[PDB]
Amino acid sequence: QTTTVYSLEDLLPYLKQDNVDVKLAPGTYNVNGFDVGEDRLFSTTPLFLFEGSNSTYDFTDVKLNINTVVLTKFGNNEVNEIQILGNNNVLKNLKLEDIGTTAPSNRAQSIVIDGRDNRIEGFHLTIRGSYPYGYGDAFGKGGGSVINHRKHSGVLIRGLRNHLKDCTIISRSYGHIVFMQAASYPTVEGCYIEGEMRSTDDMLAEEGTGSPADKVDFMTVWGYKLPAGYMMSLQAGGIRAYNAGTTYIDGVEIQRATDNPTVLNCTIKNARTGVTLAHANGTKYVEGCTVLGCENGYSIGSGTVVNCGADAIYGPVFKNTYGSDKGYNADITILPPSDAYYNGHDAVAYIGGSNHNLTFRSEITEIPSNLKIMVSGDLQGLRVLHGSNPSQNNFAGTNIVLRNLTNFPVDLHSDSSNITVTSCDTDNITDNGTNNSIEAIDC
């Protein structure tokens, strides 16, 4: 009972209907500035507002090119390209590309998933257009920013039991790539998520150019001049959950934290973090993932990370977020480097909180001398120097199992206690903590 349409104009009325089975015919469809206006294709934002329920939309072999100037055609208002408000919808196989790099007038998201039991599968999304682009979050990601931002993020998962499956999300925009706000039981599965990087040294080389960073003398939002020797993503989170947000289900506005997120078989490359779910409540579960060249690998706060890998070229593979982290169980492989090392954090892992069970595995034999597993201590992390983000650094670790099946050294700080360490080698383990146990393992 599939209805096939051959233009965006004939597609739009179906987005208001329940129980439809619609296919946009293979082809290339362009959305330009002249398509936005009262008498034009798109009079309102979101451009594609899926209000119906129990519908299926087939975008196989559809290329949708959206000119980034459309992000400025709705005044000082947020522009979403796609938003799902209905329930039990399936959208599949769309290839969506932002054309050009024009920044939104306010902010933008490519896709916002509200409602319940929706699935977006097989999408290929290229995100462009944001301001400032080139600094990551160094000069602001919220209010009071050093440089005023106009962010543009990829997929915002909200609602209930919403599902992003087998998608490719490429971001060249300052914003999250995939993030969750007020989402209950979201699932991200089989996705490839990719940003790009820039060194802080390259940013500092803007001295004397009159760039926005040069005009503030490179003073970051963290309270200090941008330090040399770090590799930053130009994006925010690869997959990042919020402890806040607004969603809509069945007409009901809901403000709540993300809860019960699941991330399965995802690859995240060159983002600010691979998988960060520490701010979500409920059960956090991450399995089968690969994090490459991110500033941080896995930070879920509490729950399970199993059969996951990350390299350590730009940041630690593992970070406890706060000293209140409790019950973080993790089995992480430190992968061979995906590119040259540029890790100014001087750690492959930062461990704290209590009652964790942590296994690290690696076949790396060539260990850079600045890389160690830290239990407590003063992490030289880009965003936590000099008292910045104080709850995220310099906290105690107690009652933690640490199985170090790697050649990386371990430093147990004086704030660590009751750490049960097993390790391939114990000669490179420094123990300044209280009542820690260190035992050797064979190979």
Author numbering: 1 to 443
Copy the relevant paper text.
FdlA from Flavobacterium sp. SA-0082 is an endo-type fucoidan-degrading enzyme that cleaves the sulfated fuco-glucuronomannan (SFGM) through a lytic mechanism. We show that the FdlA-NTD adopts a right-handed parallel β-helix fold, and possesses a substrate binding site composed of a long groove and a unique alkaline pocket. Here, we report crystal structures and enzymological characterization of wild type (WT) and eight single mutants of the catalytic N-terminal domain (NTD) of FdlA, revealing its unique substrate binding pocket and identifying the key catalytic residues.
We first measured the enzymatic activity of 12 mutants and found that eight of them (D137A, K141A, H176A, F179A, E236A, R240A, Y242A, and Y242F) almost completely abolished their activities, H279A mutant retained approximately 65% of the activity compared with WT, while mutations of Asn243, Arg272, and Tyr322 to Ala only negligibly affect their activities. In the WT structure, both Asp137 and Glu236 form hydrogen bonds with Arg272, while Arg272 participates in the shaping of the alkaline pocket. In both D137A and E236A mutant structures, the side chain of Arg272 switches to the opposite direction compared with that in WT due to the loss of the acidic residue (Arg272 in E236A mutant also exhibits an alternative conformation similar to that in WT), and partially occupies the deep substrate pocket.
